């Protein structure tokens with residue numbers, strides 16, 4: 001009752017799977033009113049239109065005894081691009097004002113964010129508004145890679161052994177979505193050369209943490 | 210009576226049954242039980258889909274089915290007038306007969322039908338902010354007041370048709386107003402079969418069609434036709450058959466009975482298919498001739514490598530379930546001929562819907578117009594079971610110039626967003642980009658959105674240039690030997706288009722002095738990366 005408004009930021013490396021986890025949390029919330037404010041439904045909008053859309057979503061969110069709103073891929077809303085830099089000021093000011101506005105008496109709210117560039121948000125003095133942050137990591141060991149390959153269920157036992165013998169000798173750094181894409185790309189060759197191409201792609205993609 | 214087929218509509222099996230069940234189930238049941246229950250009647254429905262797929266026809270047929278009076282067709286753009294209180298007056302004139310007849314006859318009145326066409330051009334979301342009210346904030350208010358107001362009308366039905374179902378107000382779609390929504394999409398094989406039967410029943414009856422015409426074949430041939438396209442095909446075929454009959458009669462003194470025997474039509478169908486009808490949601494054969502103009506000549510292994518990689522990507526995007534969206538980027542030095550290979554891959558794709566987006570058609574356009582054009586192209590691409598879209602130059606769409614640097618941010622955001630949006634369930638897409646400056650793209654952080662990259666190199670050996678000259682076949686044997694001896698050294702660096710231009714320029718001198726000019730031009734050019 002002393003904290004009617006809460007916030008949280010989910011951040012990590014790209015191709016790591018943030019939106020899915022945010023949606024899963026929202027679904028498991030069991031709240032009467034759940035919404036998503038994504039940037040792919042505002043293609044071509046100017047600044048003021050985006051401001052109006054965000055305000056309209058939050059106005060509706062303010063008319064229920066409970067709520068939950070997800071703002072995902074913030075850096076797309078702000079219109080950021082490293083050259084310059086350049087971005088939109090009106091949207092940033094609107095978001096900063098809305099992140100600390102209390103609903104009418106007796107009602108409650110919860111906001112979840114998402115991003116892939118934490119430092120750039122830190123430079124704008126934004127992390128002073130979010131109450132806390134959570135970190136989503138990538139795959140960082142051969143055992144986890146083999147476990148994921150098993151759970152997906154693509155390769156046989158002999159191929160599992162062949163890949164393990166070579167891949168258990170060091171550490172790896174790869175996201176989950178990229179892993180699915182690599183598997184799908186590998187499966188287009190003839191049955192003989194599948195594992196070789198998979199290993200070649202994995203070696204090429206591998207980079208220092 | 211339902212008999213969807215008898216009425217004159219084919220391919221609408223479920224989008225008719227659901228309508229009949231949900232909306233019209235309380236108009237035909239015995240009045241006694243309906244009155245005993247005490248349930249009102251639905252007050253309208255909404256139809257949205259691609260143009261030319263048979264919406265207005267369904268509205269008129271529904272109107273005729275219920276013994277309703279003559280519908281009042283209205284066009285959305287025509288209601289607006291520039292004086293105060295003229296648009297509202299027009300919107301308020303359509304509901305006169307219903308009010309008068311209910312006031313007179315009590316509760317035994319008939320049924321009136323009103324058809325709004327392009328309902329999204331007068332009814333847009335109202336502006337909440339003070340001082341930011343729209344210009345058409347009164348038409349919507351008048352329409353909302355009339356549809357369901359203080360005085361009830363229980364003898365009306367409003368049918369609205371549109372194409373952009375997401376711009377319409379949200380107070381106009383609650384269960385009281387226009388509470389049923391339906392989608393009419395492009396017909397599949399069975400729908401085309403039914404439509405062709407409906408449109409050739411008359412010719413079959415009058416005994417004019419040949420015995421060698423097979424409707425199933427023509428059903429398979431047309432892949433993304435709508436109804437209007439099929440009807441136009443039939444009419445064009447019959448017209449060309451008439452023209453052939455007249456030509457045969459005039460050319461020769463043959464008996465008229467022979468001409469009437471020739472009145473049967475077999476080749477007309479294929480001729481019209483290949484030369485008369487141009488689908489909007491189908492492959493276009495007129496553009497590849499304008500991009501791959503001089504053809505693909507195999508001068509080395511790199512061409513084979515690139516084509517094989519493209520084929521692999523296509524085969525992946527066809528037969529996958531975990532990746533409905535795939536992207537690829539062709540990058541290389543200038544004048545290497547990237548657009549030609551991209552178009553060749555697209556042509557060899559064998560996909561129902563192929564389109565090319567290039568900046569040549571956007572001269573003088575402001576950035577917002579370019580955004581709208583790209584959005585429309587992708588929106589069209591989202592309506593087919595398979596697709597392929599080509600973005601020609603990703604460096605002129607941005608208006609990049611090294612000084613500054615200066616470019617347009619909004620188009621870049623549109624591109625970055627549109628490379629991640631997946632199509633509706635079950636449909637698949639493929640995107641091929643073509644660029645000449647990959648480093649600047651990497652600076653903008655666009656190179657991480659793509660999936661894979663392909664490299665298109667230049668000629669880098671003497672024997673490759675000699676083989677290219679052989680394939681082009683311009684110079685004779687002695688000049689061939691002279692050139693081969695001169696540049697046997699493998700330190701050449703030239704683009705294919707530049708090679709064509711140099712050959713054309715060098716050919717303009719007299720027969721004696723032709724090799725020297727070509728060699729001088731080649732030497733003047735660069736010789737290393």
Ligand SMILES: Nc1ncnc2c1ncn2[C@@H]1O[C@H](COP(=O)(O)OP(=O)(O)OP(=O)(O)O)[C@@H](O)[C@H]1O
Nearest residue numbers: 501502503504505506543544545546547548549706
């Ligand atoms: N193997 C080949 N690869 C590419 N183009 C070829 C080949 N053989 C012949 N050509 C011809 O070369 C020309 C290719 O020019 P194209 O328009 O693709 O250039 P480009 O690389 O897009 O140019 P720029 O980057 O300067 O805009 C076409 O006439 C094509 O017919």
Ligand SMILES: Nc1ncnc2c1ncn2[C@@H]1O[C@H](COP(=O)(O)OP(=O)(O)O)[C@@H](O)[C@H]1O
Nearest residue numbers: 217218219260261262263264265266404436437
């Ligand atoms: N399902 C169908 N079966 C047969 N013909 C159709 C069908 N749908 C459309 N047509 C043809 O298309 C023509 C025009 O359709 P139209 O009413 O203009 O559609 P829209 O509402 O998209 O403008 C009609 O005259 C009709 O012959």
